[model samples]
Structure formats: structure tokens, C-alpha cells
Target: NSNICEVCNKWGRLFCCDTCPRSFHEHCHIPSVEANKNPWSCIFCRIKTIQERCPESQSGHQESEVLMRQMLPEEQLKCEFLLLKVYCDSKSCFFASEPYYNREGSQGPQKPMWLNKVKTSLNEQMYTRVEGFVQDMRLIFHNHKEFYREDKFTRLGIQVQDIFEKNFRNIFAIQETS
Candidate 1:
């Protein structure tokens, strides 16, 4: 007796679904058909419990990583791991905002009149950049890194450069009118 899949409505001899009693072509089933009893499966049982369907996050681990780790040279692993880690988190903002300065006697002089103004302004701008980077990174994390449009990256890079210039303007004597 021949039949067709109830889901796809395609014609075939597969009588039932491995998960549920739903009928379909053997080829229509997810893992394919015509192999075996599967020791456990039902084409028509949707409510069935199974170990193969465990709902845990397995995103970080994949077969490709195993192959790469095994094949890559020992010294090369550090860089390889760093690159792989890039995919794991958007922590670049934290890295950028890390206090590389603030060491004892590290701050150079600013005109007393301008100190309050530039210091506050500089810190605020830096904090803004740090916060923005964190948010963008979070967006990449949640969206699987697709959240960053090319234009956005371009704009962000420009904005960071602008902040850098603004912060160092005093040292460079950046003055529009003079």
C-alpha cells in the first residue's frame, strides 16, 4: 500500500512519523527514512520525550573546533584560541575602556582654567565611548554578531577617532580660529 506525507502533502510509501503517528514520505522525516526501527521513534508521536532533543545551549562547541585544536600547532593555539574567543563575547568595549593610565603622577598638565572643563569633558567622552561600545557588543552578542551593519562599524570607528582627537586637542594645539 502506498501513501503520502500529511505535512508536505507529497506522495510516498512512508506510513508514519517517527515522533508522532503523522504520516509522510520517508524522505520528509528530518533524519531521513527507510533505515531501521531506530530502536526508538514514532512518526506520529509529538509529545514523546527523548534524550536526543535535550534543550541545552551547545553553541560554543562544534566539530570544527575539535578538528582545529587537534590539527593546529601548539604555539599557534594562543592566537587561534583568541580568534575563536572573539566569537564568544563582545568584550572589546571593556578592553578599550580598561584603565591603561591613572598611574601615579601620570596625568600631564593642563591650563588651570581649562583643567576643570577638559578633564570633565574628557572623562565624559571616554565614558560615553565605553558605554557605547558595551551596548554595541551586547547587540552583537544577542544577534549572533549580525547586529553590526558595516555602516555602523564605520561610524563607530570615526566617532572613536573624533573622541581621540578631541581629548588630545590641547596637546596638539588644535584651534579652529587661531
Candidate 2:
């Protein structure tokens, strides 16, 4: 006879931990491990039992520290510059507060079609000045790194930079089509 499932008081299909005397119902496992994976321990016993004896867990913590150190200063700067772009995007409310012409030092709201035409006519080659832009971005990050710690960039901010970089091709494509 097996022990009662920690979950459903009355259980029909129950699984027992290979490491401990405790048993679990088929659906009662916390993380829901596969039934066929033998040499498996229940959630309650696994943490206190398995990892307590494994030497690899100690090295796993060290591995994470090494990985963090692997991100070089230049690589980090590129990421920070991408984050700065997102920070500016969030601040676009400035546009709504002031009229465009007033912001540009012009009188009354005026629409100059030539301005759009001028922007469209400039056909610049792609990938010609990427190195220059990277250098400039690196300088900006170096200057600001003193104020912002790595922890300040939350998981949300990192994801924002990731999405921005993923669509970076779309950003450059806009210039190409113009």
C-alpha cells in the first residue's frame, strides 16, 4: 500500500518517488514530470535530497558568474545604446506638448512639402558608416555607464532592446525606400 497523494486525498493512479517513501497522484506532481522517467524523485524530496548531494550544482553557480563576465565592454555598450533609443521612444510625449513648427523655430503651423521631398531625394548607400555609428554609440555608453548599474536595466528593458534590435532591419529599410 502507498501513502496518500499530497494533492487529492483519494487517489486512484498514484506515482511513488524512487528516492523517498512519499507517493503522488498522476496529476498531483508540482512540476508534472513524465511518468516514464524513472529514477525520479517527488518535488518535496528532490530539492532536499538530490541537489544536496550533487557537486555539479555548486559549479553551475560558478558557470553563471563566468557567463556574466563574458559580455565584453564593447558588446555591453552596443546593448546600452539600443536601450537608449528605447528610452527616447518612451519620451516622445514631448512632441504632443509643442507644435512642430514652434519646436523648429518657425512661425505659425506651416507645411513645407519640399522638406519631405528633400528627405526622400537623399539616397544613401547601406552599411557604409556602421563602424562610425558604433564608435559614436560606444562613446555615449562609456560616458553614461558610471550612472547606470547593470541591475537598473530590468528584464523588461532588456526585452525592449531585443525587439528593437530584431526590427533594426526594418528601421534601415525605411531609409532605403525613401
* Top-TM-score candidate index: 2
What are the lDDT scores of the predictions, listed in order?
Answer: 0.33, 0.38
- Show where candidate 2 strays beyond 4 Å: 54-178
Residues 71-171 of candidate 2 have per-residue lDDT tens digits of 24332333333332333343222221222333232243222222112112212211123343333333333322322334452343345435444433332
Best by lDDT: 2
Q: Give lDDT tens digits, candidate 1, residues 94-125.
A: 22331222335334222111112222333344
In model 2, state the lDDT of residue 92: 20
Q: TM-scores of all models?
A: 0.23, 0.28
How many Å off is the CA of 32 in candidate 2? 1.4
In candidate 1, how many Å is residue 70 off?
A: 18
Clashing pairs in 2: none
RMSD of 1: 24.0
Runs off by more than 4 Å, candidate 1: 1-3, 38-40, 43-47, 51-178
